[PDB]
């Protein structure tokens, strides 16, 4: 089922200074009710009330979809994937636990390469394989 | 009673029966209208590449910077302060839906309605239950447009004494381009009946309300001398509206007077209509001219 926001859920939003949200835009936000009794509902600023990077994101990037396993693998405290991948191409990522990723490289070619090569990092275990794959893609 | 059976006759084109030459400017879609330095597009035209291209058949009418084309067949478009007539087709929780020959439906809000009583007694949620009781499906109202929505919809209100549910009579529907703009669309013709010339194409004919909101039913028989007048005006309205004539008070009065000599039942023939329309045309010519 689809979720449900509110016009005042954004930062500093009232009956007059409503925020501009169109149809077909991607939003970064967290849930507050997700039990199996109602449509889930999410607020989009903070627990305290200061939006820490939340709200509507994405202006010149690409949103693609990966499986839950790769998201779980990347969101680890002993994960060296992001540091090494960003060594080649500087990047900034906003992960999503629904199976969505937002990426933004410098060049469109680099954004294509990061988009294709990140979906395959769940497999192809590091060491004997990862350095040679990185060297091959250096080009 | 003989059940006359005539035969179809070929139509004569070019209107040679009177003879006129137009001095206007006529266009068809795709024609390139004047393309000078700076001009503003109207309704009926569009723009291509450094070109003002007409998009509908009609005649250009310009008032001092504005090129637009006026088509001869459209649907009603709402404007502020315009008299309309409509019929209820849907009764909702907090509104009705009225059909007035427009591109969409028109909304009559419960907040704007002369409830029974006609004074300050109360307005609360108890009325919402019975609002769908009195304004039922398929009734006639006569209201005034309030405002224009953002998608061509029109909101109409009934905040007066002359507006509200109508009573007995007959309805004649014509195209919404044959009613002449005026300042008094309500008339009380000295024949025995009245009429409302709705700008949306609804013509309502009813007898005069004797002396002096839908509170009164008055479901009692109407005298014989009133029906013959209503039927005469119904047939005369059909006759005037059909060929070209633009409708207003004097044309209907003139044709009504011109229709006395022969019976109301026998005027359906192609030629009796012609001999009445030409007579009204020449009477208008000898009066205005």
């Amino acid at each position: 089922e689809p979720a449900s926001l509110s016009y005042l859920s954004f930062e500093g939003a009232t009956k007059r200074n409503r925020p501009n949200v169109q149809v077909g835009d991607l939003i970064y936000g967290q849930f507050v009710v997700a039990n199996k009794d109602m449509e889930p509902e999410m607020v989009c600023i903070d627990s305290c009330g200061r939006a820490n990077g939340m709200g509507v994101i994405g202006q010149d990037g690409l949103l693609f979809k990966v499986t839950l396993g790769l998201i779980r693998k990347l969101l680890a405290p002993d994960c060296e994937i992001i540091q090494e991948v960003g060594k080649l191409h500087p990047l900034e990522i906003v992960f999503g636990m629904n199976g969505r990723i937002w990426v933004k490289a410098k060049t469109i070619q680099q954004t294509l390469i990061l988009a294709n090569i990140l979906e395959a990092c769940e497999h192809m275990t590091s060491d004997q394989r990862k350095q040679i794959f990185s060297r091959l893609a250096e080009s | 009673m003989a059940m006359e059976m005539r035969l179809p006759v070929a139509r004569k084109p070019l209107s040679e029966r009177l003879g006129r030459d137009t001095k206007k400017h006529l266009v068809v879609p795709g024609d390139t209208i004047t393309t000078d330095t700076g001009f503003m597009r109207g309704h009926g035209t569009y723009m291509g590449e450094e070109k003002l291209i007409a998009s509908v058949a009609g005649s250009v009418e310009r008032v001092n910077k504005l090129i637009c084309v006026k088509a001869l067949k459209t649907r009603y478009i709402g404007e502020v302060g315009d008299i309309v007539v409509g019929r209820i087709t849907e009764v909702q929780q907090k509104r009705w839906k009225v059909e007035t020959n427009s591109r969409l439906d028109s909304v009559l809000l419960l907040s704007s309605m002369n409830l029974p009583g006609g004074e300050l007694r109360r307005r609360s949620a108890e009325d919402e239950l019975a609002m769908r009781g009195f304004l039922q499906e398929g009734d006639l109202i006569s209201a005034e447009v309030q405002a224009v929505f953002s998608d061509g919809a029109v909101s109409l209100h009934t905040r007066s004494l002359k507006y509200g549910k109508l009573g007995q009579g007959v309805l004649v529907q014509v195209s919404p381009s044959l009613v002449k703009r005026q300042k008094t669309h309500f008339h009380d013709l000295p024949c025995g009946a009245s009429v409302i010339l709705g700008n949306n194409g609804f013509i309502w004919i009813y007898p005069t309300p004797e002396h002096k909101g839908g509170f009164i039913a008055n479901l009692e028989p109407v005298s014989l001398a009133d029906r013959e007048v209503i039927s005469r005006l119904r047939n005369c309205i059909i006759s005037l509206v059909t060929q070209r004539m633009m409708l207003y008070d004097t044309s209907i009065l003139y044709c009504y007077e011109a229709s006395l000599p022969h019976q109301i039942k026998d005027i359906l023939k192609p030629e009796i209509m012609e001999e009445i329309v030409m007579e009204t045309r020449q009477r208008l010519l000898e009066q205005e001219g």
Binding site: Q22, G24, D25, Q59, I108, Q109, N116 | -
Partner: protein, 353 residues
């Protein structure tokens, strides 16, 4: 259910790419996604994979009486179908305005080109003749359904092999692969469809677009043209407004591409025939990649069928025999009898009167 909606970031992303003339998966404008064919075991069955789309083609013939008029030919049904698994949206009776244009594209191409020889598919005239019936299924939707469906139908028709008959005097006889060897068909030419997509009002084009590129496009142009240099169908559709140099450019492109595709198809069919004739193993089974985690092989296994007699015997022996209260039937009057607790009276009579 419906399909995920399209955002306003993907449209922007595809269009900045397309303006810059670089696509997501790396292939340049005038390229195809590489192809991969796989043959069944019984004739007229193949699996084609264009990029990540799959179509299953299967031909089959059958013997009927040839209508009235056209007494010396055979008929050729077709029935495209879209499988619910191709994509979430496809639904058995809620996509009835794509099925029609697709069946039509396929039928006009295959049946009006006159490449199959339906002349020599008769046995008698006025009597039983072979009625072939092609069948294709879409398995996985990733864009360009019609190129894949056409290649699939071509290969499936160029791999079939009929039964065969003996006719002499006025007498029939029907053989079998052991009595007589199945026979191939006669195919004049190979009409193969090509599609083009137009982007931002014909200013750019892209060869062989996939499903995301399909949601950011105005209209489609398909050009079906058999081998040699002979065009067989075109069908502009979508939202496009086309020029006249562009149709010719497209025709050139389809010529080149169909040349290359026919190279591939011929090579694959030859290799497959060579394999079938050498005497090696073929079929859907010996196609599963073995260098891959999701494949496993196991030769046969007797499991242990040593005990079933004993278990069955003890089970039959170890359970209560049928009981012995036998019931009696009651007779009312010939025609109706009752068994059970019965009714008190003989029959009802004047119960309420």
């Amino acid at each position: 259910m419906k399909e995920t909606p399209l955002s306003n970031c993907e449209r922007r992303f595809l269009l900045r790419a397309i303006e810059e003339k670089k696509r997501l998966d790396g292939r340049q404008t005038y390229d195809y996604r590489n192809i991969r064919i796989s043959f069944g075991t019984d004739y007229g069955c193949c699996i084609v994979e264009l990029g990540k789309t799959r179509v299953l083609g299967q031909v089959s013939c059958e013997l009927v009486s040839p209508k009235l008029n056209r007494a010396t030919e055979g008929i050729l049904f077709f029935n495209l179908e879209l499988s619910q698994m191709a994509a979430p949206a496809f639904e058995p009776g809620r996509q009835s305005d794509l099925l029609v244009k697709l069946n039509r594209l396929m039928e006009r191409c295959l049946r009006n080109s006159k490449c199959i020889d339906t002349e020599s598919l008769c046995v008698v005239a006025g009597e039983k003749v072979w009625q072939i019936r092609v069948d294709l299924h879409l398995l996985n939707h990733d864009g360009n359904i019609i190129d894949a469906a056409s290649i699939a139908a071509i290969v499936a028709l160029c791999h079939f092999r009929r039964p065969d008959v003996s006719v002499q005097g006025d007498e029939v006889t029907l053989y079998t692969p052991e009595e007589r060897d199945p026979v191939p068909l006669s195919i004049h030419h190979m009409p193969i469809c090509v599609s083009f997509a137009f982007f931002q009002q014909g200013t750019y084009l892209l060869v062989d677009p996939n499903e995301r590129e399909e949601r950011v496009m105005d209209g489609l142009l398909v050009i079906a043209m058999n081998k040699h240099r002979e065009i067989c169908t075109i069908q502009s559709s979508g939202g496009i407004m086309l020029l006249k140099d562009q149709v010719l450019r497209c025709s050139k492109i389809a010529g080149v591409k169909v040349a290359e595709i026919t190279e591939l198809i011929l090579k694959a069919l030859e290799n497959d025939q060579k394999v079938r004739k050498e005497g090696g193993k073929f079929g859907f089974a010996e196609s599963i990649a073995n260098q891959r985690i999701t494949a496993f092989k196991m030769e046969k296994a007797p499991i242990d069928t040593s005990d079933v007699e004993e278990k069955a015997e003890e089970i039959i022996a170890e359970a209560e025999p049928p009981s012995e209260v036998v019931s009696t039937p009651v007779l009312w009057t010939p025609g109706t009898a009752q068994i059970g607790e019965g009714v008190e009276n003989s029959w009802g009579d004047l119960e309420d009167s």
